[PDB]
From a paper:
Using two fluorescence-independent methods, isothermal titration calorimetry (ITC) and nuclear magnetic resonance (NMR) spectroscopy, we show that heme directly increases REV-ERBβ LBD affinity for one of two ID motif peptides within the NCoR receptor ID (RID). Heme decreased LBD affinity for the ID1 peptide but increased LBD affinity for ID2 peptide, effectively equalizing the ID1 and ID2 peptide affinities. Titration of both peptides into heme-bound LBD revealed a mixture of peak movements in slow and intermediate exchange, consistent with the moderate affinities (~2 μM) of these interactions measured by ITC. To determine the structural basis of this interaction, we solved crystal structures of REV-ERBβ LBD cobound to heme and NCoR ID1 peptide (2.6-Å resolution) or ID2 peptide (2.0-Å resolution) (respectively). In both structures, REV-ERBβ LBD crystallized with two molecules in the asymmetric unit with an NCoR ID peptide and heme molecule cobound to each LBD. The overall root mean square deviation (RMSD) of the complex in the asymmetric unit including LBD, heme, and NCoR ID peptide was 1.1 and 1.3 Å for the ID1- and ID2-bound structures, respectively, suggesting minimal conformational heterogeneity. The ID peptides bound to the AF-2 surface formed electrostatic interactions with the conserved charge clamp residue K421 on helix 3, confirming that the heme-dependent REV-ERBβ corepressor interaction is similar to other NRs. The overall heme-bound LBD conformations were largely unchanged by peptide binding, with average LBD RMSDs of 1.0 and 1.3 Å for the ID1- and ID2-bound structures, respectively, relative to the published heme-bound LBD structure.
Numbering used by the authors:
A (entry chain E): 2261 to 2271
B (entry chain A), C (entry chain B): 381 to 576
D (entry chain F): 2261 to 2272
The structure:
């Protein structure tokens, strides 16, 4: 949820 | 209702599914999350952490960073909250829509943070300190996170000492925001999950 | 299993009902809770808060006081936890019994706290600071608690700088334990409520 | 339940 946004923004 | 100011408004169309409500809400709050991540990448030493610890610090700390960044949404004087649309809403009306002690605690936090009269550079540096101070339970190399926090904390302490009267008391009050933020995070997460 | 060192043993007799296990456990941890309350009564100014606010601070802060007081149960060199029986159990053994990242975070907290090499006097004052800094979400008169906190925090700063005049960082390091304690409390409270 | 232990010990 939050994690997937963060992971994708980190690349 | 959805009485979180990351929303454009506290009002929810009753014809929408819970799924549609969340996807629209997610469109509102996702830019803010990504800006936290972009802020994290500009912290010296952050990208030198393992990817796991980076993701974990951000999972644990994104809310607290945003709480600091958006503390000025809470106008402690007129007791209004500014939602993402820019429209302001009274605490009375938000309490009538289901807000409670958490909202009250966020007004108190915002009032006390604003009283410190931090400059933009101090506020940024404090924001970095908040992120690297996030709950460590998920962290695999705590020494590396501790060293980042130590570096930023000393940078913040010297900045406050150089710029503020009664610097030691300002700095102490700034650090006492950290457990306050941890409690706000814990309560807010429970409300978030309750909403689903 | 009951992997909390407040219990006499992490082993749970399966012949006992859930109600019997909890009553036995309550006989073990109640004396530690009552000692926190008696400690609170000896804090100058704590009895001047309203009775509602006194109970809320103890409700929210008892675990964090006990975490500080019982940090010595965590032997960071041997990697053992002393349960109320006095018997020591290893990290590895507790991890096989389901203990997790929370246990590890208690080890790191106790290691860092022990490393500050506090006198009994500073440790006692720190513990009062920990209690009066508890989550203020319930609190009715936040100003009185905030005033009591600042009083004890000021006295702690003076005592530390008096006793550690060239190690100025100790006071900062002590303030940085409060968010760590708050995260220990958040996590532990989850595990506690899951047990019942 | 924690609160009951606390209130009892606090008034005693
Ligand atoms: C991605 C980040 C966030 C998400 C997903 C989120 C989501 C939510 C949800 C679903 C609720 C409950 C809504 C309801 O039950 O009506 C809530 C409550 C709330 N949130 Fe957020 N939120 C986020 C960040 C923030 C931030 C940064 C702040 C402060 C600047 C904030 C302030 C609040 C407030 C004041 C409430 C209501 C508290 C009360 O009930 O008294 N939220 N949030
Ligand atoms: C009134 C006080 C307390 C109560 C009622 C309590 C109760 C509990 C319960 C029911 C659990 C879950 C046990 C399990 O799932 O096996 C637990 C976990 C735990 N507690 Fe406590 N506890 C208290 C205070 C403390 C204190 C003061 C400490 C440390 C000084 C502590 C250390 C732990 C640890 C290490 C665990 C296991 C953590 C993990 O899963 O990694 N507890 N506690």
């Amino acid at each position: 949820g939050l994690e997937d946004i963060i992971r994708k923004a980190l690349m | 209702h959805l009485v979180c100011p990351m929303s454009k408004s506290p009002y929810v169309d009753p014809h929408k599914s819970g799924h549609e409500i969340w996807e629209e809400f997610s469109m509102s709050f996702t830019p803010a999350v990504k800006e936290v991540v972009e802020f994290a990448k500009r912290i010296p030493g952050f990208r030198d952490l393992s990817q796991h610890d980076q993701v974990n610090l951000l999972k644990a700390g994104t809310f607290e960073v945003l709480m600091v960044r958006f503390a000025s949404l809470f106008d402690a004087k007129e007791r209004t909250v500014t939602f993402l649309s820019g429209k302001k809403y009274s605490v009375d009306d938000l309490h009538s829509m289901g807000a409670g002690d958490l909202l009250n605690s966020m007004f108190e936090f915002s009032e006390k943070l604003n009283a410190l009269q931090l400059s933009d550079e101090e506020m940024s540096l404090f924001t970095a300190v908040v992120l690297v101070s996030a709950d460590r339970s998920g962290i695999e190399n705590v020494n590396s996170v501790e060293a980042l926090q130590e570096t930023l904390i000393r940078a913040l302490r010297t900045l406050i000492m150089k710029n503020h009267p009664n610097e030691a008391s300002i700095f102490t009050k700034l650090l006492l925001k950290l457990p306050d933020l941890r409690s706000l995070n814990n309560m807010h997460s429970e409300e978030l999950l309750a909403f689903k």
